[PDB]
Design a protein around this ligand. Structure first.
Ligand SMILES: *[C@@H]1O[C@H](CO)[C@@H](O[C@@H]2O[C@H](CO)[C@@H](O[C@@H]3O[C@H](CO)[C@@H](O)[C@H](O)[C@@H]3O)[C@H](O)[C@H]2NC(C)=O)[C@H](O)[C@H]1NC(C)=O
Ligand SMILES: *[C@@H]1O[C@H](CO)[C@@H](O[C@@H]2O[C@H](CO)[C@@H](O[C@@H]3O[C@H](CO)[C@@H](O)[C@H](O)[C@@H]3O)[C@H](O)[C@H]2NC(C)=O)[C@H](O)[C@H]1NC(C)=O
Lengths: 359, 395
């Protein structure tokens, strides 16, 4: 497709540049066949190592901030589903069992049958409203897949770049020791190692540039991409709300939440009336009605927590933290690492050009 | 079981062969205004007139024979007339008591129906006006919290159901009007009949005393010119026998099938089922109002449970709403006590007892009164016939 075009072209351009550098080095070597230069090379190598370490630490910080934000937006999408499941299970099992028990107890008098039927219908309305809330089990799994795969990839890349930094430090120390030891032949015969580290630096620059351009593209219009990837799988209204949380935007769950809370209030008023007028009736029903009000109290508290949880402020803040982290920090770190790789390539080219000259 | 049973005398009286005016069989179907039944009843008057004519011509023949071809007869005639007047007075008092028993029973039934209608009207007006006004005030007060709109609407729907159920109760205005009219008519007719027959008894006693004085005064001409009055009172006695026999036959026909006729009278203004229930109930019937009363009292229970719950959970809101909510519970208390009184009223025991009192006061009392009054008429006719027969023979 046209999306792969930029990445593939940049990769092939970097590969062709590395090949051209190798051919030029071979031509220079076949054509061929200082303390100040040494300190200059050491200073440039130290500067490149510092730049690379800072960029790698920056990218590490950013890609663990991204994982933290993913795991803090995953916990909310799990607690919300837990609350919805708990409320649905409660009203489906405990309330129905208790109301059936109460009806069996006080079926002797048929006046309260009408209000018991009305409260049964209100419980059914509550269950229907609760089922209307979206299930996040298809987004939680996605945020687990990302939170695991990105962590693994970041750890592997971090280990690889620490290995590269260690190799560069080792080669610099070996060069310094060889210079101090009057340029031992075996010590100074590391032209193959120089070629290998130069091609590794070129490949690192290629990968850094490819990742930088890819993340820049995916940060150019992040909302559209996230809507086309997962926002299409789920209802687009909820994604629209969570993404661009704003005061002007009307909440998508306000109607369902207000109907559910009104139904809870109506059930509470029926239960209170039954409690007050059940004193003339058998007091064994008040034992069950106390459980009914316990269920209603717990449901009201859970609903208040849930409506404090669907609020777009927290999710929008977590999403913005994740986006700022990945985009800004990763772009800065990858640019720093690309500069590091360019510095290493130039230093290695200069060393190769001045290798036989010093020898 | 307590119920209406036809006594032997009323069925025996009904057992006489009914005839039309032209001597042809007529059915015993009771019909106060129908032509054939009115003619059948007038046939008894015609027969009594024929009997009076036969007695008059026989007496004339006897007097002519004894004139052309002394105090024992006068004493016998006077004693027989006195006994006849005694029997007539007893019968008249008995049937007067029967008619006023009917009047009292009708007034009692009318009062119960009026109370029923008043309770229904009061409850319907209360639900239409007071509950709705108080609910409007309460909604205006607590519109700040939008949750209670659902329960207010539900209990307003309960109010609509209550009004619809109450409107289904029968309206007794027509029945009360009919009962009042019938009571007025019965009181008027009974008073006039009682006064007329006391007048007749007094006139007969005066004629007997005049006979005694004339006999004791050696047949004074001014006390011997009483034969005209004697003939007039004899024909009056025969007309009284006509009227007594006619009324006895009519009321025996009624008493043969009382409940069927009562159902026929008001078989369209009100549902026939409730009329049948009031007329016939000894142990237990379907009680057609029971379903409506149960649904209405259930609706009141839901009313009051909504109001109690709203009272309990409206104290977090300012208690200004309680000034209306306690009034609402006052309305529900009054409605519940009124409904209990009403369901006590709709029980068929009271109305059936009133109906059975009216039916006994007619069947078992007026029939005997009319029978003894007809016996008075026969005895007075015979006594005055003998007295006139002994008139010319005395001198
Ligand atoms: C991201 O969210 C998912 C679910 O939305 C989380 O997965 C769930 O994690 C909990 C607790 O870690 C699991 O409960 C328990 O897991 C243990 C295994 O550690 C198991 O032996 C217990 O029986 C119990 O199930 C739960 O199973 C798991 N899965 C689901 C579908 O709820 C996850 O922890 C969150 N964080 C990350 C980084 O993925
Ligand atoms: C028998 O029951 C009735 C029902 O309550 C008692 O009230 C009387 O109801 C009749 C209805 O036919 C009233 O007659 C009407 O009076 C109005 C004037 O108010 C007149 O315009 C109509 O044309 C009709 O005649 C009657 O007035 C009313 N009586 C009273 C005192 O309110 C009735 O009293 C009961 N009968 C007895 C003897 O208690």
């Amino acid at each position: 497709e046209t999306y792969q075009e930029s990445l593939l072209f940049l990769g092939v351009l970097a590969a062709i540049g590395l090949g051209l550098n190798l051919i030029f080095l071979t031509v220079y070597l076949v054509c061929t066949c200082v303390t100040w230069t040494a300190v200059v090379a050491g200073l440039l190598c130290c500067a490149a190592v510092g730049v690379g370490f800072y960029g790698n630490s920056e990218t590490n910080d950013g890609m663990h901030q991204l994982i933290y934000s993913l795991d803090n937006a995953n916990h909310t999408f799990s607690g919300m589903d837990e609350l919805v499941s708990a409320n649905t299970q409660r009203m489906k099992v405990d309330l129905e069992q208790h109301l059936a028990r109460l009806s069996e107890i006080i079926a002797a008098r048929g006046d309260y049958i009408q209000t018991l039927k009305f409260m049964q219908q209100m419980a059914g309305n509550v269950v229907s409203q609760l089922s209307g809330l979206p299930v996040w089990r298809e987004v939680t799994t996605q945020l687990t897949k990302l939170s695991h795969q990105t962590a693994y990839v970041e750890y592997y890349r971090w280990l690889s770049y620490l290995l590269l930094f260690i190799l560069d430090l080792v080669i610099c120390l070996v060069t310094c020791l060889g210079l101090a030891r009057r340029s031992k032949c075996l010590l100074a015969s590391m032209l193959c190692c120089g070629i290998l580290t130069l091609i590794l630096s070129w490949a690192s620059l290629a990968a850094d540039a490819a990742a930088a351009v890819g993340t820049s593209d995916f940060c150019m219009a992040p909302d559209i991409y996230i809507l086309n990837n997962t926002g299409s799988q789920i209802n687009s209204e909820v994604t629209r709300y969570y993404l661009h949380c704003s005061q002007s935007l009307i909440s998508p769950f306000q109607q369902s939440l207000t109907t559910f809370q009104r139904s809870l209030t109506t059930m509470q008023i029926q239960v209170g009336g039954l409690l007050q007028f059940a004193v003339p009736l058998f007091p064994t029903a008040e034992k069950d009605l106390l459980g009914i009000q316990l269920l209603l109290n717990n449901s009201e508290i859970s609903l208040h927590q849930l409506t404090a949880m669907l609020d777009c402020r927290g999710l929008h803040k977590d999403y913005l933290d994740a986006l700022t982290g990945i985009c800004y920090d990763g772009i800065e770190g990858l640019l720093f690492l690309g500069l590091f790789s360019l510095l290493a390539a130039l230093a290695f080219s200069t060393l190769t050009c001045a290798g036989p000259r010093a020898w």
